[PDB]
Amino acid sequence: YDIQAWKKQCEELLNLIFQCEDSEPFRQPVDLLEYPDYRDIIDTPMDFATVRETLEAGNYESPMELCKDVRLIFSNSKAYTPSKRSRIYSMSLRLSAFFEEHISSVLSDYKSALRFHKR
Numbered sequence: 001y002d003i004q005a006w007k008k009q010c011e012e013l014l015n016l017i018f019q020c021e022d023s024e025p026f027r028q029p030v031d032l033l034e035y036p037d038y039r040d041i042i043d044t045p046m047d048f049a050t051v052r053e054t055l056e057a058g059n060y061e062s063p064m065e066l067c068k069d070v071r072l073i074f075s076n077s078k079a080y081t082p083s084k085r086s087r088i089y090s091m092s093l094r095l096s097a098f099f100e101e102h103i104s105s106v107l108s109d110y111k112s113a114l115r116f117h118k119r
């Protein structure tokens, strides 16, 4: 019933994500010299360094907000990919599975803790 615990739980999950080779393409912004069409296709860039910085700044109120930005990383990769069998998109799908597997308890515990707080 700790309604602050999500933040360190998210910090540790981001640490795991940064250790994971599959996160390489998603740790920083897209160079438009390398992908000149990227911002034609993608209105709202997002990367794991921006998510970590937002968390560390104290600019997420809940793990739901963090989860929305992480999911945007993945939806951006799905929108940008030229193919469902693109290397970087395939990395996104494995990393998304890993993230969803690990964030589910963080969201459950937060929402339970907040229901207890308001009981």
Ligand SMILES: Cc1ccc(C(=O)N2CCN(C(=O)NCC(F)(F)F)CC2)o1
Pocket (backbone or CB within 6 Å): 024, 025, 026, 027, 028, 029, 030, 031, 034, 035, 076, 077, 078, 080, 081, 082, 086, 088, 089, 092
């Ligand atoms: C070919 C394909 C399919 C899907 C994606 C994709 O999701 N992108 C574009 C490449 N990208 C970076 O260029 N990331 C920056 C750095 F420094 F890590 F390279 C990550 C986002 O790209």
